[PDB]
C-alpha cells in the first residue's frame, strides 16, 4: 500500500516509494491521506486513452472528487467552448512569432544578473521573471505596466503570507478589468485584444469571463515554466556529460527541452474522478472512483522509452505526457517549448562556467503535492 502524494528524494527522479508500482501496468493503486484508494495509471498507452475520455472529470466541486489533501474543473460542453475561444492565441505560428520578444526578455534578465555580481539566486533573478514577462507580452499588457505586472505575478507565487497572495490576485483582477476598457478604445495585439475582437464579433467572452481567462493563463503559465527553467538548469549542472553535449551543439537544445520535459515531469499527479464506468482492458474504473496520472512514471514507461530513468538527447521523448494529453492538454505547450529553448539555450551560451554556488543537497525544492521544481538555485560562473 503506497501513500500518494509523496515528496521526491531527488529533485529529478520520481518519489522512491512509487518504484514497485511501475511494473503493475497499465493500472496500479495508491492510498490518499484519508485512506481512500484511487487508481494510479502507470501505462503510457492507457494514460493517453484515458486522458481523452469524457467520462473522467476534473470538477473538484463533485462530492466524489478525490482530495489528495477557469478551463480546469470544467467538463464539456462548457470546457470545450472556453478552449475554442483561446486555441487561436496558442498556435505554433503564434509561438514562433514570439521568438524575438522572448529572446529580448531573456537577454535583459541575463544582462542585469551578470551586471549585479558574480553570483545569483537563479530562481528569483531569471526562472521566475522570464515566464511572467513572456505572459505579459502574450496578453498584450502595455510596456508602461510591465513592471506592475511582473511585481504582482511574483507576489502571487512568493507571497509570503496568504494575505499577499490574495491582494496580488485582487490587484491583477482589477488591473485586467481596467485594461479590457483601455484596449477597447485603444486596440493593440495579444490575447486580450484577440478576446475583445471575439466579444464584438460573437458577444462570446463577457468582461468577467475575459478577466478569468487572463488570470488562468498567468497561473497555468507562470510557475510551471519557471520550475522547468530552474529544475532543468539544476539537472543539467548535475549531469556534466549531458550539459557538455548541449554546450558543444546548440542545435541539440530543442530535442533536449523535450527530453527534460519527459525526464522531469514537473506537473506530476494529474487527478480525475470517473463520472461513469470506464473499462481499461479487463479492469473497470467504476463511477465515483478517483484516477491519478503520475506524469513522471507514465513518462518512464520502458515499453515506450528505452533506459527511461536516464537523460538521453538521442533517444526520442516524442509522445511524452508532460503537457498532459487529450481533453485538458496544455494550451501553452507551443509557447512553453520556445521559452525553455531560448531561456536554457541563452543561459548556456552566455555563461559557460555556470556552476552551483552551494552543495546540491542544501538547495531547496518543492514538496510532493504541488508543481515540482526548485525554490532557490544559487549559481556562480
Ligand atoms: C513547461 C511549462 C508547462 C508545463 C509543464 C505545463 C503542463 C500542463 C499540464 C500537464 C496541463 C494539463 C493538466 C491536467 O490535465 O490536469 C496543462 C494545462 C494547461 N496549461 Fe500548461 N504547462 C506549461 C506551460 C503553460 C503555459 C506557458 C501556459 C499559458 C501561457 C499554459 C496554459 C495551460 C492551460 C490554459 C491549461 C488548461 C487547458 C484546459 O484545461 O483545457 N501552460 N499544462
Numbering used by the authors: 4 to 72, 85 to 396
Task: Paste lines from the article.
Crystallization experiments for full-length CYP105D18 yielded crystals in the space group C2 diffracting to 1.7 Å. A Ramachandran plot analysis of the refined model showed that 96.55 and 0% of non-glycine residues were in favored regions and outliers, respectively. The final model of CYP105D18 exhibited electron density for most of the molecule, except for the N-terminus (amino acids 1–3) and a loop containing residues 73–85, which connected αB and αC [dotted line in Fig. 5(a)]. The asymmetric unit had one molecule of CYP105D18. A flexible, less structured loop was observed in the B/C loop, and electron density for residues 73–84 was absent from the substrate-free structure, indicating that this region had a high degree of flexibility. Taken to­gether, these findings show that the B/C loop in the active site of the CYP105D18 structure was flexible and remained in an open confirmation without substrate. Across from the heme molecule are Phe338 and Gln348, which correspond to Phe441 and Gln451 of P450 4B1 and show a closed conformation. Notably, the substrate-free CYP105D18 shows a small blob on the heme molecules, as depicted in Fig. 6, indicating that the heme of CYP105D18 is oxidized. Structural comparisons between the substrate-free and complex forms of CYP105D18s revealed that conformation changes occurred mainly in the B/C loop region.
